[PDB]
Design an enzyme around this catalytic site. Sequence first.
Site, PDB file in Angstrom:
ATOM      1  N   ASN A   1      -5.791  75.298-124.866  1.00  0.00           N
ATOM      2  CA  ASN A   1      -5.591  76.820-123.828  1.00  0.00           C
ATOM      3  C   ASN A   1      -4.722  76.522-123.126  1.00  0.00           C
ATOM      4  O   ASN A   1      -4.782  75.481-123.018  1.00  0.00           O
ATOM      5  CB  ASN A   1      -6.882  76.551-123.592  1.00  0.00           C
TER       6      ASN A   1
ATOM      7  N   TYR B   1      -2.247  78.706-119.498  1.00  0.00           N
ATOM      8  CA  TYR B   1      -2.450  80.042-119.086  1.00  0.00           C
ATOM      9  C   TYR B   1      -1.302  79.854-118.029  1.00  0.00           C
ATOM     10  O   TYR B   1      -0.062  81.006-118.084  1.00  0.00           O
ATOM     11  CB  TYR B   1      -3.173  80.776-118.712  1.00  0.00           C
TER      12      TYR B   1
ATOM     13  N   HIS C   1     -19.050  78.497-125.946  1.00  0.00           N
ATOM     14  CA  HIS C   1     -17.872  78.964-125.543  1.00  0.00           C
ATOM     15  C   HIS C   1     -19.038  79.514-124.483  1.00  0.00           C
ATOM     16  O   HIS C   1     -19.288  80.661-124.239  1.00  0.00           O
ATOM     17  CB  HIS C   1     -17.635  80.030-126.139  1.00  0.00           C
TER      18      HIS C   1
ATOM     19  N   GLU D   1      -5.774  78.974-127.068  1.00  0.00           N
ATOM     20  CA  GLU D   1      -6.024  80.482-126.038  1.00  0.00           C
ATOM     21  C   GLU D   1      -4.285  80.669-125.294  1.00  0.00           C
ATOM     22  O   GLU D   1      -4.013  79.586-124.928  1.00  0.00           O
ATOM     23  CB  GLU D   1      -7.144  80.400-125.248  1.00  0.00           C
TER      24      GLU D   1
ATOM     25  N   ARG E   1     -10.815  83.959-133.852  1.00  0.00           N
ATOM     26  CA  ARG E   1     -11.339  82.574-133.484  1.00  0.00           C
ATOM     27  C   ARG E   1     -12.540  83.026-132.742  1.00  0.00           C
ATOM     28  O   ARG E   1     -11.741  84.125-131.831  1.00  0.00           O
ATOM     29  CB  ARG E   1     -11.126  81.344-132.319  1.00  0.00           C
TER      30      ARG E   1
ATOM     31  N   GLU F   1     -13.441  74.430-123.329  1.00  0.00           N
ATOM     32  CA  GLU F   1     -12.929  74.500-122.188  1.00  0.00           C
ATOM     33  C   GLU F   1     -14.524  73.302-121.114  1.00  0.00           C
ATOM     34  O   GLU F   1     -14.466  73.811-120.505  1.00  0.00           O
ATOM     35  CB  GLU F   1     -12.297  75.269-120.755  1.00  0.00           C
TER      36      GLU F   1
HETATM   37  O1  LIG Z   1      -9.715  83.412-118.421  1.00  0.00           O
HETATM   38  C1  LIG Z   1     -10.213  82.918-120.131  1.00  0.00           C
HETATM   39  C2  LIG Z   1     -10.668  83.028-120.440  1.00  0.00           C
HETATM   40  O2  LIG Z   1     -11.542  84.245-120.853  1.00  0.00           O
HETATM   41  C3  LIG Z   1     -11.926  82.188-121.408  1.00  0.00           C
HETATM   42  O3  LIG Z   1     -13.294  82.841-122.236  1.00  0.00           O
HETATM   43  C4  LIG Z   1     -11.092  80.871-121.208  1.00  0.00           C
HETATM   44  O4  LIG Z   1     -11.575  79.788-122.397  1.00  0.00           O
HETATM   45  C5  LIG Z   1     -11.703  80.246-120.038  1.00  0.00           C
HETATM   46  C6  LIG Z   1     -11.474  80.563-119.268  1.00  0.00           C
HETATM   47  C7  LIG Z   1      -9.580  80.917-119.931  1.00  0.00           C
HETATM   48  N1  LIG Z   1      -9.662  80.961-121.803  1.00  0.00           N
END
Ligand SMILES: O[C@@H]1[C@@H](O)[C@H](O)[C@]2(O)CC[C@H]1N2
Length: 443
Positions: free
Chosen positions: A290, A292, A119, A348, A75, A164
Amino acid sequence: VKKFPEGFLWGVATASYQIEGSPLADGAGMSIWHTFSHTPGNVKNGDTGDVACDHYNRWKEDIEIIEKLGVKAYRFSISWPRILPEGTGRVNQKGLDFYNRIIDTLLEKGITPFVTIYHWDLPFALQLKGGWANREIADWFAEYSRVLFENFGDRVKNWITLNEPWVVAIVGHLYGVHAPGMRDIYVAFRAVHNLLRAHARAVKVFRETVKDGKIGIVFNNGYFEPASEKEDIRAVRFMHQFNNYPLFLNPIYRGDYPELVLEFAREYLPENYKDDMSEIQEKIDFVGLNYYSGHLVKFDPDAPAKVSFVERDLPKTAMGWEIVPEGIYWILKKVKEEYNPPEVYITENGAAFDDVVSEDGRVHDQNRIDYLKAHIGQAWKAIQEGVPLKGYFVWSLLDNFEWAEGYSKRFGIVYVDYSTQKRIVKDSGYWYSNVVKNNGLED
Ligand SMILES: O[C@@H]1[C@@H](O)[C@H](O)[C@]2(O)CC[C@H]1N2
């Protein structure tokens, strides 16, 4: 052992401004991240994307790393101002040539390209005309998307309109922490709305131009938990609907913003915003999530949105992000339960830790292995319970420019020494490679 479905797509992910460098090479226009990071005070240490990982020159080496690791999907994003330096009108063949070489190389090597159209590197020329605040961006974005589909759609079959869009609107135009660095709540909600309209116009154009491909959209998501049994439950409901996929998926699937988003933000949306909803309902092929971190959340009367975060004594990454693996399982279950998209991808998942190269020449990132293993395990669970997860992308292939944090946050499974541009595969990259080869987890 935890084996994934046959043909499950193990991938890695990057973004153009974060890795490429050479933002003005070969006729490229400036992006808003170029001008934002060149503005003193906006990015940690004065860092910019001028050089980054020099992927603009080192792209072949990097793809050879993907191949050597046996990763089956990549990606990556396309820089809009490399393609259309003024945002609309003129097409730059050298921008097309750059991504053509990447695409052709991936295909030759049996790696599936997943292309993110946007992006975050909006052409500066379009920001001068109001950028995401301007309704006309639905037109500009459709024209840009059409150029990509016509040039690459013969080879690239998996597309993502937006990365995002919550962050683009809210962090870019409300918080002012990302480009274009604005703090206006009315602009921020018009950007939300225009991001949806632009996404839908691009999908419409995709259907006319790329007979065989699939197109989706990517959302950031947190796992929100209530601080107590109380209105804390509702503060969680608000955070989910606002910060997660429902802000965008409720329009796409149901034709309106979520109920608690409207309670908070109706005064900030255009007055006749419903007029755009039937077009926003344009059919999509997959949802990219995504994920985290988790967050403890409480009602707070004094907060700008009546919600404040509560710090927990939980393991955190170098981002300060609480490690909550069950969150990735929750968001996968929850997306099926609420919108039932035909396909889902984790586009992600990853972590920033302060990686060092040891005396043995290696990067012993066991913390990142542990993080990835746990989340891949929770993703496996969701699959066993019927979530149509087709793929999983580690953020990131490489250490890179982490937006307003600059180079101070390393998310790669491959270490980049920025003084020499040397890539050192981390323990986590070797570990992941074995996961992909085995098509899952073993111990
Ligand atoms: O921290 C990530 C960043 O590195 C990536 O570009 C993202 O897509 C935007 C914030 C989070 N995910």
